[PDB]
Ligand binder design. Structure first.
Ligand SMILES: Nc1ncnc2c1ncn2[C@@H]1O[C@H](COP(=O)(O)O)[C@@H](O)[C@H]1O
Ligand SMILES: Nc1ncnc2c1ncn2[C@@H]1O[C@H](COP(=O)(O)O)[C@@H](O)[C@H]1O
Lengths: 420, 421
């Protein structure tokens, strides 16, 4: 019989998922493989019922995939249902795969999607490969080299903020833009720098391993006041949602409205419910609205996951999908498909999943780097040297209707809070 | 006295010129420099008259540059007027640069623009010259894959234009022959074609022989059409690099400009811009294939890409180039080019980028031996070496073109020796 290749998506979508599906499917079909796609990740595979999976499994033919490289989202949907936890759920998945005569199993998704594939992984009977998916640019790819979907997300964010930059200057106002995603500051920083935003704050720039609510308020506050000292009572500040995952007990308590933070049954805090931008706007309007400043929060997140892929991501995901089929052919299994140095190569599971955490390592922003310093130079902010500038402190202090003494007492310490 | 930074653009525009302008201007202003922008490149500096120059130079203030990083084009315009030739013109350009107290001089442009900048350097510690390599074509000798600024914006817009044409050609069955402007290299054409899933792309790099024949290009497109026809599809999109023309033989060019002699500029320099490659191919192919019910339409993609607003990748890129230029002036550099390699912006020295024979910066073509190119080929529709040996397939494609399999092989099988496999 003709070998069967089964494909699914797990976790949250990123632009280009359809590109991976098509890159693997079209090439597979050129070899005479039957391709099937599982709807909603492992959701229905975890049940083990064969006719339930068949009913949520589709034939991925030429016509179905021929033009989805233009399309955001995933045509086979996705789910966060991961069997990684239970030994039984795993057995249920294998039963359906074997019943479907799946010879080649391809998963596209995040950390939990790959752990599911490895737990479910007879290399001659099957072969399993995951394609690491993250919009956040936080794979340990050789620094600079992006993860797929990141270019699409950064570009669309840049366009959204451009409109906000025009609206903020046209009708003076500050926007606090919350960039969804707590893993890393790549998306926040890229949108901000691309767009020329007047400030960006990411968790990586804070020296201390923990962040205080009031230091974030004061960081944005000083920028507003400096801009105001230059006659501009408007701007745009981009905040990475990860700021909240680095906040202290007390800080988190202020963030949730000076109330005990919400809690899941196991004690793990439910950080999704926080509203970092809405909170900072509240506090800032208290301190600053008496100067003629208006402040409005704005979230950017969900509109980015399924935007149509930009051309870089189109080419990227076509090469990733092809590279999956090449790994399958050349006998690989239990490996991850990544592009490093213009080559798509299967990096083995062990050789890329950090066994300490039991998960692929996280690439954060490098704030010691030349790139980060350049971005900082076009932001509006109070540097160390700025604070030691008697004449400058006099104008910004005047801007905020306070003495130069109070200004230094309040803000000068921030040089020790974030890297210079 | 505050130092004077002078800026100008030469050559054709590429998305992100304003990004470089603003990246450098804003940082220079954070240091207290005066910054001026010469309008239309070297056009008004070659004259040497200082009143006329003063008229076509502007003060690059904070408010002029603060938001242009969103904007395509160049706010100080550009020009191909290169003083690289006559030594009189070069003393004139230097009389105004020295008359304006221009301490630092930044040019943004291509080969002729940098060749111009260098020649005027060869001038006392009173001036320091730097050029910023610009090309939409991606043909700078940067480490492989790494792009020149403007390429991403151009490739992306091209993918969007071709997407519309892909929908149109399938909705109302038709073939489009898209001509991607630029004869330097195949990067732009291949990138647009691959991102868009175009059914064929043809670039000069993929042809083995130094020279190309008109009839080989026709037949390459013809085989793809016929193969799609044999799979039920009388429609598609084919992307062509305009650089096919610069590789054509005398006999090929003779057929391209009609069946006449090619036009010549004085001194024999052929006038290749007048060619209409995709229109010519479209003519010939409708002679051969129209009886099969095939419609074929040329479409050029080119000028709409030069001044598109830059995508985020290019906004960041040009911000970093503009910063890196100021940082280089500050460190006492001069006679250098600003490039980004391995994520760092560094001033490569001009002597270490200029090929000897050509005198200009090494040209980086498409690497057709790479995995990248092979991957792009697999999603194209075409007859491979193996396909020509497949008997059942050759019988289907020949029937689609209403010929015997022997007439099909005699006409097309030799194309496996024309382009790399
Ligand atoms: N934090 C900042 N970020 C970007 N530009 C600034 C900043 N502070 C001042 N500028 C600009 O830098 C230039 C120098 O201003 P001054 O400090 O008055 O010499 C002016 O164009 C200011 O608007
Ligand atoms: N040159 C080509 N490029 C891309 N796909 C092709 C090409 N030729 C055939 N196909 C597709 O490959 C699959 C298998 O073709 P076949 O070998 O005829 O079964 C079908 O979906 C065809 O439409």
């Amino acid at each position: 019989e003709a070998p069967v290749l089964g494909i699914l998506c797990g976790g949250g979508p990123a632009p280009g998922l359809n590109g991976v599906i098509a890159g693997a499917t079209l090439y597979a079909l050129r070899l005479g493989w039957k391709v099937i796609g599982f709807m909603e990740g492992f959701k229905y595979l975890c049940t083990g019922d064969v006719d339930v999976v068949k009913a949520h499994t589709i034939d991925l033919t030429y016509d179905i995939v021929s033009r989805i490289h233009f399309q955001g989202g995933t045509i086979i949907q996705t789910s966060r249902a991961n069997p990684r936890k239970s030994p039984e759920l795993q057995e249920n998945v294998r039963k359906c795969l074997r019943a479907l005569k799946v010879r080649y199993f391809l998963t596209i998704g995040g950390d939990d999607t790959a752990s599911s594939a490895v737990s479910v992984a007879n290399g001659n009977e099957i072969s399993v490969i995951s394609c690491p998916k993250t919009i956040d640019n936080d794979l340990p790819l050789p620094a600079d080299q992006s993860t797929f979907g990141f270019h699409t997300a950064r570009s669309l964010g840049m366009e959204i903020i451009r409109n906000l930059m025009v609206d903020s200057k046209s009708a003076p106002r500050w926007f606090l833009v919350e960039a969804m995603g707590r893993s890393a500051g790549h998306l926040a920083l890229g949108m901000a720098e691309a767009s020329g935003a007047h400030l960006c704050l990411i968790p990586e720039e804070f020296k201390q391993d923990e962040i205080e609510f009031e230091d974030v308020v004061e960081l944005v506050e000083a920028t507003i006041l400096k801009r105001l000292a230059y006659g501009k009572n408007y701007g745009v500040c981009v905040l990475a949602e990860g700021l909240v995952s680095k906040m202290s007990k007390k800080a988190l308590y202020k963030l949730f409205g000076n109330r005990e933070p919400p809690t899941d049954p196991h004690g793990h805090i439910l950080l999704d419910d926080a509203e970092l931008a809405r909170s900072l706007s509240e506090e800032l309007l208290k301190r600053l609205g008496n100067l003629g400043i208006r402040i409005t929060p704005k979230k950017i997140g969900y509109e980015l996951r399924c935007a149509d892929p930009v051309a870089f991501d189109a080419v990227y995901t076509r090469e990733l999908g092809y590279g999956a089929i090449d790994a399958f052919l050349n006998g690989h299994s239990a490996a991850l498909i990544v592009r490093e140095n213009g080559q798509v190569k299967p990096v083995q599971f062990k050789d890329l999943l950090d066994p300490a955490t039991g998960r692929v390592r996280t690439r954060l922003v490098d704030v010691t780097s030349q790139s980060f310093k350049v971005a900082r130079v076009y932001m509006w902010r109070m540097s160390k040297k700025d604070y030691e500038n008697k004449d400058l402190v006099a104008r910004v202090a005047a801007a905020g209707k306070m003495t130069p003494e109070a200004f230094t007492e309040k803000f000068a310490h921030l040089t020790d809070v974030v890297v210079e």
